[PDB]
Amino acid sequence: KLVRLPGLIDVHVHLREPGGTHKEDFASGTAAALAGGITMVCAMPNTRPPIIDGPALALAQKLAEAGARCDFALFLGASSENAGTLGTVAGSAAGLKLYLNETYSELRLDSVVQWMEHFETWPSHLPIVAHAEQQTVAAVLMVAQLTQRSVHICHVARKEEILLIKAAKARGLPVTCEVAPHHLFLSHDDLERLGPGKGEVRPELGSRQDVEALWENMAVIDCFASDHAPHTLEEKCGSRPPPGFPGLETMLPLLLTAVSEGRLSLDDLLQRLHHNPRRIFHLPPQEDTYVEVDLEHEWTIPSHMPFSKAHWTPFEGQKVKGTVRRVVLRGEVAYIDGQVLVPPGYGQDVRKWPQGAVPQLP
């Protein structure tokens, strides 16, 4: 007896194309998405070259249209030089991404004034998401208030951060946030097993108290999103390990396990992987699209999942209950039982659909 879910949306993925295609490309990352029950992804701009201007966006759009197997939207990235220059293309992007801390990106902004300039110049009706850890969450919230608009906080990982967001929501401030599965299902207790290289991620793995605070404050979490951040094992185990975990293929099985254990409800899951992504990012429905999952099948996560070119996973050895059996995307069987059955290029840029434009006043 399978359960039919709507097409799930991951608003935070790194697909590495252009420029890092040994780690992942549109075709492989979207195969991983489909195998994870995800039918729409929003791809981050920290590629090589980074998606920080109109020519880079145009290239990325064509690479995605040719390689993606599920539907997508592409973020633009904020830089120290592009505020005020993105107005013509802004509405074609998922939103604008700000990198406000050290992480796998060359896009760090060096002054809060640059953050203000982006909040003032990016069109006010379009999404802004921020990588903002610890006190940076409070700082970017201040910039959002000064500029009288909303912000979405990426990968919240700490008790400190979720409680700050909780306090902001209690004051009626327009802030939303997402949490990634590694910050719900891994902690410092796992760094022994992972090692210091594999274990590198931003935000770093939290304490048990951080993990427990995120679960305790589930009501504050608007979205789940994988922060699928594929790097090869050679890179993760080498001398200068880049931060990030692959996660598209493991996210849904991990969360379904938690549903089966009563840690959150099926509805809680679908708000966070479907409805809230849609409404925060103004992402359109996908016609004739659904995911069938089997909630009874118990399995152990292996040393690598089948599709991501990362070819490793930090969840190796965890027991899960829940598997994706079939994905139908826009009337076509896209995935069955370990086989992806739509080719590279089946996926489409949802921002080009009539229903995928963000509504705005004339």
Ligand X SMILES: NC(=O)N[C@@H](CC(=O)O)C(=O)O
| Closer Cβ to a copy of itself, 4 or 193, answer by number | 4
Integer Cα distance of 183 and 73 in angstroms = 24
Binding site for ligand X (CB under 6 A): 14, 46, 103-104, 131, 201-202, 227, 229, 242-244
Residue 227 marked ligand-binding: yes
From the list 103-111, 136-144, 282-290, 319-327, the region that binds a copy of itself by CB under 8 A is: 282-290
Which one of the listed residues 227, 267, 268, 288 is annotated catalytic? 227
Contact flag: residue 179 with a copy of itself (CB under 8 A): no
| Closer Cβ to ligand X, 249 or 259, answer by number | 249
Closest CA to 69 of 101, 111, 40, 98: 40
Closest CB 165 distance from ligand X, rounded Å: 17
Site string for Zn ion, 46-85 (x = CB under 5 A): ----------------------------------------
Q: What share of the chain is helix, strand, coil (3-state, %, to 5)?
A: 35, 20, 45
Q: Which of residues 156-185 bind Zn ion (CB under 5 A)?
A: none
Q: Which residues contact 146 (CB under 8 A, 6 or more apart)?
A: 116, 119
Report in angstroms the alpha-carbon separations of 155 from 14, 97, 134, 345. Answer: 13, 13, 11, 29
Q: Which does 104 bind (CB under 5 to 8 A by kind): a copy of itself, ligand X, Zn ion, none?
A: ligand X
φ and ψ of 162, to 5 deg: -70, -35
Element (H, E) at 194: helix 191-198
From the list 28-36, 165-173, 230-238, 331-339, the region that binds a copy of itself by CB under 8 A is: 165-173
Integer Cα distance of 225 and 40 in angstroms = 11
Q: Which residues contact 17 (CB under 8 A, 6 or more apart)?
A: 24, 25, 26, 29, 47, 60, 63, 64, 67
Q: Which residues contact 305 (CB under 8 A, 6 or more apart)?
A: 32, 35, 246, 249, 250, 313
Query: In the set 220, 229, 273, 301, which binds a copy of itself (CB under 8 A)?
Result: 220
Contact flag: residue 282 with Zn ion (CB under 5 A): yes
Q: Which does 201 bind (CB under 5 to 8 A by kind): a copy of itself, Zn ion, ligand X, none?
A: ligand X
| Closer Cβ to ligand X, 49 or 243, answer by number | 243
Contact flag: residue 355 with a copy of itself (CB under 8 A): yes
Q: Which of residues 124-143 bind Zn ion (CB under 5 A)?
A: 129, 131
CB 90 within 8 A of CB 126: yes
φ and ψ of 47, to 5 deg: -85, -175
- For the question of residue 337 being annotated catalytic, the response is no
Contact flag: residue 272 with a copy of itself (CB under 8 A): no
Query: In the set 88, 219, 239, 319, which binds a copy of itself (CB under 8 A)?
Result: 219
**Spacing of C-alpha 3 from chain mean position:** 24
φ and ψ of 52, to 5 deg: -125, 5
The catalytic residue positions are: 227
Show binding-site residues: 12, 14, 16, 46, 97, 131, 154-155, 178, 202, 227, 231, 243
